[PDB]
Amino acid sequence: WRKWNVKVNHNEKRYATASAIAATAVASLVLARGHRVEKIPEIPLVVSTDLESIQKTKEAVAALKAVGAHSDLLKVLKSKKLRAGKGKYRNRRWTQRRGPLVVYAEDNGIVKALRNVPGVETANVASLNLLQLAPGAHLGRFVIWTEAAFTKLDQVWGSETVASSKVGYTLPSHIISTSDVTRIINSSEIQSAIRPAGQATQKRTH
């Protein structure tokens, strides 16, 4: 009767999921969390809905390598190591890395075709696990979206025009209008209001 399962507010759960999906955009956090995505053309990596109906694992890894997830795929299955303690004889024998998450709208074979591939995880847009999107509480999983998946993400989370399809939910507000303060500090309307600065390391008088 020690507490095992912990309660989180549903909105704070959804807050973290929205901020995790947002982190699977621009590539700085995706590089930072591993995820060999230098030679990707652009992030988010959206592929066609024809991926959702691939039913053979040979054809599935052909498609993921062709859109640039080859180095992420080979990052897994070269990181298979034995676990470093007593857990290797608690049915936790091997450790490896996380690969590309493939997000779909319809399962027409893509889950089973990507099932055996090491590191590659799959997800519906309706679910979007935070344990998959930020594994290790580290933002920026490499995500391959299908085209139907990427369109549906307006329905599932809402926009400024479409509500949310969750009851009462709105995507969270910002408390700052941009993440760059240096642009605000160097804006002309602030740079006129300020006094001139000093030497940035004072000269030692006396």
Binding site: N91, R115, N116
Partner: protein
């Protein structure tokens, strides 16, 4: 990965089921692959190994050595092939235990039940 709910990925369970397997269940555990000729000739890839089968060792220190199996010594989880023995220092000749997965069967000792087993696995039998 495992999808059924009756098979087990428990290590302790799986090693117990191995190390306490009875003789009839150790027969299928002590299977051996077939040669390039036999897999071409029959169409099956491995067989539970029998006594008077002819084998070629493809691994270990006795690699490349041919012979006929004198004993399938299921208690020790091993085969003992004739002509692959160890000389003791006192002139004696003890056989060397080989695991059949490191062998390759080069000739089948055939009777009706081996012939029926090949056709059961979809083999040519020619």
């Amino acid at each position: 990965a495992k999808q059924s709910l009756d098979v087990s990925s428990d290590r302790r369970k799986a090693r117990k089921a191995y190390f306490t397997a009875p003789s009839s269940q150790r027969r299928v555990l002590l299977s051996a692959p077939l040669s390039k000729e036999l897999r071409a000739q029959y169409g099956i890839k491995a067989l539970p190994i029998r006594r008077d089968d002819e084998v070629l060792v493809v691994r270990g220190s006795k690699k490349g050595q041919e012979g006929k199996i004198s004993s399938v010594y299921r208690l020790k989880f091993a085969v003992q092939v004739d002509k692959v023995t160890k000389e003791k220092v006192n002139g004696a000749s003890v056989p060397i235990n080989l695991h059949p997965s490191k062998l390759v069967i080069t000739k089948l000792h055939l009777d009706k039940d081996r012939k029926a087993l090949i056709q059961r696995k979809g083999g040519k039998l020619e």
